């Protein structure tokens, strides 16, 4: 089941951004030829998208093929939506509606709060000093996630 993590990481500069694992563009299909590690979407809470196929089929290939993709459309709520990942170069990327009160792009429910997740610190380094509060809210389904707030 770990075979669905896309692993394409071209660190040709020797930055080391892969250590964490070992220790304004709208959401859409993103070809996994450009993914380095987990692809998390935040519907109202964290989910771990894996390498899928275009018809939704889960492919256990680590994202090797040209037509291995991630599917971020397919998790949108019928609401506010964002996803993140680390592309191969190690630059963090974001997809979500444009913004005040309105949420950010990828994991920013607030302009100042972030949905804390297992690879949050890897994807967002500046967020370390943020302290966490717990939240339980309906928006038809009951979600439970953690907030990392500025």
């Amino acid at each position, epitope marked *: 089941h*770990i075979n669905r993590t896309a*692993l*394409n*990481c*071209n*660190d*040709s*500069l*020797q*930055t*080391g951004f*892969i*250590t964490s*694992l*070992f*220790y304004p563009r709208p959401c859409d299909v993103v070809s996994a030829r450009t993914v380095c590690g987990p692809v998390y979407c935040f519907t109202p809470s964290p989910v771990v998208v894996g390498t899928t196929d275009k018809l939704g089929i889960p492919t256990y*290939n*680590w*994202g*090797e093929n040209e037509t291995d993709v991630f599917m971020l459309e397919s998790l949108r709520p019928p609401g506010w939506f964002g996803c993140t990942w680390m592309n*191969s170069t190690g630059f963090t990327k974001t997809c979500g509606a444009p913004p005040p009160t309105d949420g950010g792009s990828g994991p920013w429910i607030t302009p100042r709060c972030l949905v804390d997740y297992p690879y949050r610190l890897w994807h967002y380094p500046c967020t370390v000093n943020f302290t966490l509060h717990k939240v339980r809210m309906f928006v038809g389904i009951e979600h439970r996630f953690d907030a990392a707030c500025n």
Partner: antibody, heavy 129, light 104 residues
Framework: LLEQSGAEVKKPGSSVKVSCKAS????????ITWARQAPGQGLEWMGA????????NLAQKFQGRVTITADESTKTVYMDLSSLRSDDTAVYYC????????????????????????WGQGTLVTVSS | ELTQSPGTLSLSPGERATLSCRAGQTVASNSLAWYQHKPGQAPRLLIY???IRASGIPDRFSGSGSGTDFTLTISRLEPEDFAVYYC??????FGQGTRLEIKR
């Protein structure tokens, strides 16, 4: 520093399993290669392994015959060849191809190769009846 | 797909040993190494990458080459430099090494 196993003598039919003790602390992201040389012929590269992800990809010659595995409980990477021949009676070295953390590798699951700065002592294996 | 030449070399200390390492299909000059192997010892790394000297490698050894062709060179031949020299590409393949011998 890479330590290796003792010289083993095995019958041609049976398999050999030689270890490699690894020094450093980032064992999860070490990419380790095995390769050997024939008393007459030159060096040739068998394959490289990744312990944390358990992914190897090997030369065209030993793609079917050899299996590489690693166990990180003990800082050791193992090396196993089924149905030895006299062609495979040779000297077997262990080399650290690269560190995944700073390697800039792990493309498409399969690991690419980098220079092998540390090299194991080597394990001879005499394969005769 | 590495073609070394010559097979053997025989030179006297203080001479310039020049040894080629060729490729049928072009290599990215990024990934090409040289190794010094002594019997009863473990192979040693001399050049990593392209024209870069590894650590613990005297100044005499010198990498070179771009594209398909490549060369190791030594200007001061010291008397321990007479081991067999393999070249190698990463990605990975070797050549049949060259033997460096003591002219007497």
């Amino acid at each position: 520093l890479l330590e290796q196993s003792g010289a083993e003598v095995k019958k041609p039919g049976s398999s050999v399993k030689v270890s490699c003790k690894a020094s450093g602390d980032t064992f999860r992201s070490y990419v380790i290669t095995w390769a050997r040389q024939a008393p007459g012929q030159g060096l040739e590269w068998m394959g490289a392994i990744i312990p944390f992800f358990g992914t190897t990809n090997l030369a065209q010659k030993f793609q079917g015959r050899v299996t590489i595995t690693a166990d990180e409980s003990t800082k050791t990477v193992y090396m196993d060849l089924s149905s030895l021949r006299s062609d495979d009676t040779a000297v077997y070295y262990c080399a650290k191809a690269g560190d995944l953390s700073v390697g800039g590798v792990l493309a498409g699951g399969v690991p690419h190769l980098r220079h092998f700065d540390p090299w194991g002592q080597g394990t001879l294996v005499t394969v005769s009846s | 797909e590495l073609t070394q030449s010559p097979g053997t070399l025989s030179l006297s200390p203080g001479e310039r040993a020049t040894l080629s390492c060729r490729a049928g299909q072009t290599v990215a000059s990024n990934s090409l190494a040289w190794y010094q192997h002594k019997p009863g010892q473990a192979p040693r790394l001399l050049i990593y990458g392209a024209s870069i000297r590894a650590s613990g490698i005297p100044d005499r050894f010198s990498g070179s080459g771009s594209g398909t062709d490549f060369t190791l060179t030594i200007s001061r031949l010291e008397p321990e430099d007479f081991a067999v020299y393999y070249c190698q590409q990463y990605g990975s393949t070797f050549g049949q090494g060259t033997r460096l011998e003591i002219k007497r």
